[PDB]
Amino acid sequence: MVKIRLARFGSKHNPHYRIVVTDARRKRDGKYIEKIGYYDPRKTTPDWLKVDVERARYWLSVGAQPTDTARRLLRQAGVFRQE
Amino acid sequence: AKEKDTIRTEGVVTEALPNATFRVKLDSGPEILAYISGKMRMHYIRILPGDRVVVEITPYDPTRGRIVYRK
Amino acid sequence: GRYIGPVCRLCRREGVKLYLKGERCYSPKCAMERRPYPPGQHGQKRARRPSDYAVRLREKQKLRRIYGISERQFRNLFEEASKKKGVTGSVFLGLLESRLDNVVYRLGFAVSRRQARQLVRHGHITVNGRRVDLPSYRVRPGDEIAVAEKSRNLELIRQNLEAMKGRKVGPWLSLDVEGMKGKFLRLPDREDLALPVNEQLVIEFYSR
Amino acid sequence: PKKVLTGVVVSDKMQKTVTVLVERQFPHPLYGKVIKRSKKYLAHDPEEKYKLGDVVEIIESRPISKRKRFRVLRLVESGRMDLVEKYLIRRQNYESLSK
Amino acid sequence: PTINQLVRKGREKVRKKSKVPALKGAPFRRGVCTVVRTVTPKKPNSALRKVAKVRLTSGYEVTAYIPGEGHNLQEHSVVLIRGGRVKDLPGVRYHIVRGVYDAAGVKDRKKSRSKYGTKKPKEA
Amino acid sequence: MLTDPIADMLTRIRNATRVYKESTDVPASRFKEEILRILAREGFIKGYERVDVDGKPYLRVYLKYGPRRQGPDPRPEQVIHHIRRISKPGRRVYVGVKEIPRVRRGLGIAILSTSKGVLTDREARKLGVGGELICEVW
RNA sequence: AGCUAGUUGGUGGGGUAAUGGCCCACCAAGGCGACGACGGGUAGCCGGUCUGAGAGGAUGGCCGGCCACAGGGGCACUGAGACACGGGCCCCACUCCUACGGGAGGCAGCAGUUAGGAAUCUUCCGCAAUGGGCGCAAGCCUGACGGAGCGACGCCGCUUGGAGGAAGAAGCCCUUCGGGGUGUAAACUCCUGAACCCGGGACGAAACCCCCGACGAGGGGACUGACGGUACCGGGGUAAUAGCGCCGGCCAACUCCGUGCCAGCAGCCGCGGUAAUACGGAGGGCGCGAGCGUUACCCGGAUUCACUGGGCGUAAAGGGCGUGUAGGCGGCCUGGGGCGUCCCAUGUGAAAGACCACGGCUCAACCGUGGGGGAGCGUGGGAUACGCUCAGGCUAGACG
């Protein structure tokens, strides 16, 4: 299965996440397919979370299955919204 | 520390050996390999086999000595 | 840590006065004003031909000591300067100056550089809004330095302010002398500063 | 873009197999002096339509034999034994300089 | 020479032999002595330098230079070697590192301590 | 056999400059002529023409020199100090448009043969081309 | 220095998801090779890492990708996928039980034991985050992971105070006996206030879940912390660890006593055999600073394997010459091909790093974000001066 999932990248107590497109069976930090989003849970950043929407949509269309956190993030950045 | 546990014992020079090293027959037992002291070298005081010389011997290895005394 | 020990000894070594205590290192007392010779036994001994390396080394020591920094840190700063585009020397000097403790000193917030550093450490100094207690800090220009509010009470600070109340600051800095504030505007130049440094020599020393 | 090469027939001793020497010219990684490297490829031709002395186009194909992975696309130019002769001479020399 | 020649052969990369077969490039190697004696240097120098034939955990028996002011080492004693050519002596490319195992520190040493394995003396 | 022509020509020129011979000879080719033209344009030579000595096409190469500076070694000032044929045979050096050398950081030239004819480094830069670095000149 | 007999090819078959000498039967007698085969050693490979002006050279730890292996060997099976790390079968090596017939094992998973060894961690907590598997889901598991512990092992940050304070206390050391040094260093005055105590105390965690809405979007609500009562803020609050190397030249720093080619130092030259700036100690200095030195190993400096960039009459170095194969190189003109060569476009060159910009942790390390570059390689177009190649011709080379 291909998932849009999150990848930790930062440091001890200072995490950062890459909302990413990739096969299930990889290292949670491994060679993914495409970087499409970045998010910080610590929200420190004025521009913290940002995703690239069109790419995400495309991925969804092919049938990339997002995990829960990732899904939430997508929703927040309005990938799942429809108008 | 500068250690003077050194033995200052007499020995009649037995063997003419190379490099101003001379096996000298001690009266502290056998003939050890005893070499010339630098002073002797400086003063050009010649040792031939048969000289009753004082030979400086450290306990660590008595194998080697030193011709301290000018014959 | 720092140097931390006998200071005007460094002054003595250098051959030139280095204002490292401020006052006294202003009066007839830096031991340089009187006693103008290297420390140790052979102070008045025949003054000999310094090696090409040696002069450079001395220069480096002068400069490094002036700001009072660990060698490692200095080296790092130099490296950074080299990396960054521009005249590696002048730029290096500017970077050195841009240091928090030095900035504090140049404002007349403390008469001495070590003293300034101490002040900075102790949560007496606040840049823009936060206290900063780490004297190596890069004051990036367009920045305001202030005395902390819960410590702007201190007698020493007041005295220091008075000592600069009137007398003119450098053209790259500024200050509010009343509300205990300060401005950093221009990242200073080689020609903005009057240190007995000859930074070329320092650079040469570093090269190998 | 099925990798294609201009090479020269050097042998037809095997059924349907034409041996082709590709002389590839590239510049040395360190020196840049332009070297001339020959590599043999055994090529598939169901006709034996090709002979020694012929220069041919060679296509990177699907295999037919362990170490025969090229079909002969097309004939370029016949009547240049020159290049083959040299190779043969070299081969002969190879046996000589041993013992 | 000329580029074609170079291409044919290349440059024979200067493959470097090490000055120490303590093996594994091991910064230190431990061993036990077979003998412990003193050795005359050569023709530039005349002194008596203390040295020990030491068998190794790799098997290579090395005479090894004891430094300091005078050792306490006997025979069946564990010693640790740092290498590093001694100029005067033959067969000896090795310093014993005093301050570990049986080679106890240089007593009375008061200046350059670390090299010798001397604990800090207590001031006033 | 004259294994390089261009290099030989260059060498001859150098020799002439050394000995203060005002004009040298050298067999005629198109490439050579082009090179000479470039040199002339630059100002490395007074002039050149194409004679027929014996019956064989040849080039009059009118050499250039600097004013006779007096004193110790009065010998005329050198215009071409050094000229090295870079892309020798059996070592053909092709530089890209990124790689075209800053020869004496400006003061002199590299004669580059390009797809767009024989020329100098500045010219190459102007057109935006790389090619073969026949020779270095200063 | 020759290697090869399933070995190189063919025909037919089998086997495979699929090509194939993968295997087999039959036929052919080839195939590779000095442009370095086979043989031996060595060694996971790389993105990179370090050095380096660069070209390069070494290195391939962590982090990422690929491979290969799970005591050694051999084999399949099941399955989408293994020849299957904590699945199976077999022989052997080894440990364990045994009622001697036989069984059970495999930490190169985390942690730990043991050995080896210079040397390398806690038989830690947690499912909170993120990811994995299962599942409608709740949830279940998860030594992936997230953290803490131990080690100056590395990098980076901070403290060991600061301000005054003698024409110069003592202590110690040197002296030409006046003096100088230590050194504003101390003491002493003043201030600050790591430690340290108490008060509060997180961001990381809003989802999945429930309901309105059709189980869609959207909207409201709830639970949810190993770190850790930590980070951090507020008050209080004490002047509160300095070390290590060197000190002849290189190389930055000099004197005295002790020693006398002895004891000793040494990275090299070398120093020491009685006035040692080289040894031991003291003061003084100088380097660095919670480190600093030694050793190992790599590069550099070594333009000392040299492409950038070395040479060869005498220094190491021209072979004894000749002919000649491969190979390398090659006059002048004209024209074509366009392989080299160049160029443009474009595809690639994953992320991480390195480089620039900005941002975040009080700075910085560290991280985040954005950008740029990038040798090489593929694909389409272009250019023909140069090399290649094809054709024609020339006479300077060469031959007659």
Ligand SMILES: [Mg+2]
């Ligand atoms: Mg989850």
Ligand SMILES: [Mg+2]
């Ligand atoms: Mg003795």
Ligand SMILES: [Mg+2]
């Ligand atoms: Mg078939």
Ligand SMILES: [Mg+2]
């Ligand atoms: Mg086979």
Ligand SMILES: [Mg+2]
């Ligand atoms: Mg092998």
Ligand SMILES: [Mg+2]
């Ligand atoms: Mg191996």
Ligand SMILES: [Mg+2]
């Ligand atoms: Mg390499």
Ligand SMILES: [Mg+2]
């Ligand atoms: Mg196995």
Ligand SMILES: [Mg+2]
């Ligand atoms: Mg199956």
Ligand SMILES: [Mg+2]
């Ligand atoms: Mg298995």
Ligand SMILES: [Mg+2]
């Ligand atoms: Mg398994």
Ligand SMILES: [Mg+2]
């Ligand atoms: Mg496997």
Ligand SMILES: [Mg+2]
């Ligand atoms: Mg383990």
Ligand SMILES: [Mg+2]
């Ligand atoms: Mg043990």
Ligand SMILES: [Mg+2]
């Ligand atoms: Mg052990």
Ligand SMILES: [Mg+2]
């Ligand atoms: Mg660990």
